[model samples]
Target: TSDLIPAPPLSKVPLQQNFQDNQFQGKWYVVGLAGNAILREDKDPQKMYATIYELKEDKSYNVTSVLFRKKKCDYWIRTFVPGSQPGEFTLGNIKSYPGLTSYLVRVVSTNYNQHAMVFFKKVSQNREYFKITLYGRTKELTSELKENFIRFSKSLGLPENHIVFPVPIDQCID
Candidate 1:
């Protein structure tokens, strides 16, 4: 069966102009997330998380993400391979994740100092989904930044219900 879920056209997705990989290397906090399918299926509410991007000599990034869930802290490490286009990337050396076939990521926008927005598309054997994340340089973000994230998510065709500002957590922040 063909995938029923729809994703925003990649061509229409706006990306950061002249994205500087070096400036973007640092820590960012996950303030909000918007998803079409995967997040909707989760029963437990999501919480805020943290991620660090370390630039490699090959122009790839060593990404380290920390998540707090189920009363425990979990860490995920992945390599992000740069694409031909700026601000675009694909997960590299990814092990088989169930039926997952492809995962694409893009930096929608970022100032490299305060806030950033990212988009993700995951294609699997039976389905495809899209997710957007709002990242802040600090654990807390300004209301204006949060509003911008919501507006961007809506522009991508995600419903308001699909946009969530995960509850802030002290765990896994450091």
Candidate 2:
């Protein structure tokens, strides 16, 4: 863990310009994530399975994120529907929690095989968190891709240690 400071939860991060939802469709592996809450928690990165995104004809996206409670084997799904804005979404599946809003920003993908890095920011009435996830067309991310992670992390105001490469768990229920 280095001395680099992370972006505060309440900090407002900029969004990517001219985002097209069409190219964002398909399954993306959650290779790495950085933020406050996700940063404070101590757990294995491998607990995340994958995030499936389906762009609807109405310009809305159906997001399916499969992740485990801890670093355990058991997994669950959290689905979110599209909100009012482009790349903006609303999540209301969880019973106890109120509505949550998310923004899909700074999504960069390579033309080769859909390798991508997705930046997401989630905000609620009393809660806030940001996630910059490095994704790949497949489960593997080359060393070249790893080099870009630090730059992106710093751009988001996260310390070097805040960035974590999650383990890919195949235990998902179709």
Candidate 3:
């Protein structure tokens, strides 16, 4: 039987609770990623380092991000403001790319040392998809953490093949 099926409903997916912004600060490497459309299209996993500075007086975060490929590197800065929810945040105003918006709803699963995040995007004012993203405090994650993320994604009814564990880099940190 040929079953031509459509994608599942992901708009009702859940978000993490009790997320602490203080513990989320500092450097976090892009160790894991899972999304419908790859945020950065690269044949090889590029080296990425993100520094989350302390909250400003208004409670927004200043983030310094660097992406490296081979010997070349690029830099950018973004600020995130708290959303109506405790662990939710609104990404900066920019349309440099396509596919998804910058709304971030993440949690510090285990702790700041080894945590994971998910990013949600809306196609329009009334449509969305399971644009989940993951992050780790270090370039490498423990086997347990990797397994945990996979399980979590499955629980959300997400496709298993979309998950990825990024490759670490020796350079580009400064």
Candidate 4:
């Protein structure tokens, strides 16, 4: 993207795979790439996930993601900050991680079977948590695809250990 090296080609799982009403309403296991460590991979193999996306009048979408822990996944009203570019949003959790940020998220998905992108950025004037990072899509990521993503990260000077990928999302709630 920034250079001719190419920012790693992205693929979609097809519009057919895109969720319909209540399609994503059930329990989903953590399947792939965390991009950076916000949560451990293996530790959350079958974490609960629930999201409500409101179609905005504009092309943009108003989406909310909720994660269920072994006990609870509290989703306080977050004022998500949209990136300069579209489809990217960010949120801060100073109460959770003082002097640091939870992270930035890239919802690099379209209307099709979408995915998200998360990466840790060096924040200035702004504080970033040690766990601060970027997270992309984890759904529908194949082994080869994940390896490619990891390679792309390494090429950017980041190590695989910096990332976390969980499994068990292959199962369908239906």
Candidate 5:
């Protein structure tokens, strides 16, 4: 009964041109997120989160994400392995509550300093879901970047109601 839309082909989705992994290594705030998962009625209220990308010698990234939920600061670390293409990555063996899913990730657009837009496809036994994320070096992103994020998500079949701009939280930023 998932209202999730099918993801577009990877070949059709555009990637950042000459994306530099080194320049992209740093902390980014998750300003916006679009996916069916967020549409759940019982889902927790959205709050701003941060992800730090530490580039490894092998081109993989050690991504650490900080989240604040239920008055407690939580964090998770995962390895994003590079794909054959430059701006593409695969994250596998995710430890979920009851199951796990592998995710294919791509940097759709980025300037490596101010903002970045990323696409994610989660594959599981029963379902596959797509998500779009907007990242910014600061909590406040430019209107143009927000518009571009909406346009990109709409082009991927995500509805306007599915897109969410999380409210900023003062905790767990650093």
Candidate 6:
């Protein structure tokens, strides 16, 4: 399995700027994830079955996930990386733990709704990659909200097919 499928860089979540600040903050449920967290040898992405996002008014947010145990957690914050504009923010994992390092070295894409919040990540800048659809809020992205993903990819010179839907394993996902 020497062949490696390198992903691409993340610019911005298209149409994410369409929503107001307050509307973009909140909880988001897992919908789909792209790229793979697998090591180059094993190629098995860390199981991100149940992930959540919680966005704050300060343009900051929290992401708590239950992959195996709740202890596999990291606290992340969002800030506009200078050129990305005001409402458009990128996620950065502010925590530093040995096992939790995978959450670092990444950026996130997010949007919010009354019932749920949505966030995705652009991980490992040294390589083209990202993953975990539900960055913080609580609701699974609706069909309408799902289209934002397509727009995000199209902006990156990729075909819509590059977007990979999550694999359903249990009640945690849709």
Question: Which one wins on lDDT?
Answer: 1
In the range 1-174, model 3's lDDT, one tens digit per residue, is 222122345355555677777777777777666655444445665355554556778877887767775567667787777887766776766464464454554442536666666555544332444455567776777788778777766666556666677667756654
TM-score of each: 0.89, 0.67, 0.72, 0.47, 0.90, 0.46
RMSD (Cα, Å) for all candidates, in order, is 2.4, 5.2, 4.9, 8.8, 2.5, 6.8
Worst lDDT window (10 residues) for model 3?
1-10
lDDT of 5 by residue, 50-139 (tens): 999999888899999999887889989988998878999988446642444668899999988999999888777668878888999999
Off by over 4 Å in 6: 1-15, 36-50, 55-57, 68-84, 91-111, 114-125, 131-163, 167-174
Error of 5 at 134 (Å): 0.3
lDDT of 1 at 132: 91
Candidate 6 has an lDDT of 0.42
Clash count for each candidate, listed in order shown: 0, 4, 0, 16, 0, 15
User: Lowest-lDDT window of 10 residues in candidate 1?
Assistant: 37-46
Candidate lDDT values, in order: 0.86, 0.59, 0.61, 0.39, 0.85, 0.42
Between candidates 1 and 4, the one scoring higher on TM-score is 1
Regions more than 4 Å wrong, model 5: 40-44, 92-98
Candidate 4 lDDT, 91-174, residue by residue in tens: 534355455434444543223233323333333235332221222233455565567556655654445565555433222211
> Lowest-lDDT window of 10 residues in candidate 6?
97-106
